[PDB]
């Protein structure tokens, strides 16, 4: 059968609709300032794919990269929180939760669903913002504290274009993003 479209589970299966243009909504804000002020190592986030499922639900993939490589042994837990979607929390790593879905907390991807409803214009909607909660050097990972050299060990990194100071420093750590409604690439 066809594999042009990514298939999704359906209330059954359905054809995903891939969005062609995934736009950083605020690439001229300074995001680094907000991590630097908290002594958090800089990270970046990109949205690398968006597929419309149905309704206003999209399956998105993110890619998160730290400035320096931090070995997995330092990590205790990693989760996406505050998600506007089917699941409000997406566990990525945690011994307590038997979850091992990444192998490098400084270079990882994650795929999850969001409800994207706030219009940019008549064709495009914003990603709803979320946070990524990192806990290093807790539990069993505390034993590696003597070689830790990357600053603050437990922190949340947030997305968005809607929170910045009067000098263009973001109060978020990562940009917000937008894409076409229903991933209809012919809108407009």
Residue 85 binding partner per list Mg ion, Na ion, none, with a CB distance cut-off of 5 to 8 Å that depends on partner kind: none
Q: Which residues pair with 157 in a beta bridge?
A: 132
Q: Which is nearer to Mg ion, 78 or 183 (CB)?
A: 183
Residues of this chain, 35-54, that bind Mg ion according to CB under 5 A: 51
- Indicate if the alpha-carbon torsion angle 90, 151, 33, 46 is positive or negative: negative
Please select the residue that binds Mg ion; options are 6, 63, 65, 169, rule is CB under 5 A. 6
Q: Which residues pair with 15 in a beta bridge?
A: 7
Residue 118's closest CA among 159, 179, 66? 179
5 lies in the site for Mg ion, by CB under 5 A: yes
16 lies in the site for Mg ion, by CB under 5 A: yes
Measured CA to CA, the distance from residue 110 to residue 102 in angstroms comes to: 8
32 lies in the site for Mg ion, by CB under 5 A: no
Residue 32 binding partner per list Mg ion, Na ion, none, with a CB distance cut-off of 5 to 8 Å that depends on partner kind: none
Q: Which is nearer to Na ion, 124 or 153 (CB)?
A: 124
Measured CA to CA, the distance from residue 184 to residue 143 in angstroms comes to: 51
Residues in touch with Mg ion (CB under 5 A) = 5-6, 16, 18, 51
């Amino acid at each position: 059968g066809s594999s042009h479209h990514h298939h999704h589970h359906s209330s059954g299966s359905s054809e995903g609709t891939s969005c062609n243009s995934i736009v950083n909504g605020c690439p001229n804000l300074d995001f680094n300032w907000h991590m630097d002020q908290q002594n958090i190592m800089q990270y970046t986030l990109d949205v690398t794919s968006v597929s419309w499922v149905q309704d206003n639900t999209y399956q998105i993939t993110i890619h998160v990269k730290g400035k320096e490589n931090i070995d997995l042994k330092y990590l205790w837990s990693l989760k996406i929180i505050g998600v506007t979607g089917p699941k409000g929390t997406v566990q990525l790593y945690g011994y307590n939760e038997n979850t091992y879905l990444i192998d490098n907390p400084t270079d990882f991807t994650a795929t999850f669903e969001v409800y994207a409803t706030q219009d940019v214009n008549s064709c495009q909607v914003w990603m709803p913002n979320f946070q990524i909660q990192f806990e290093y050097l807790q539990g069993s990972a505390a034993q590696y504290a003597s070689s830790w050299q990357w600053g603050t060990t437990s922190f949340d990194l947030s997305t968005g274009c809607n929170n910045y100071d009067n000098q263009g420093h973001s109060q978020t750590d990562f940009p917000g993003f937008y894409w076409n409604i229903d991933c209809d690439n012919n809108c407009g």
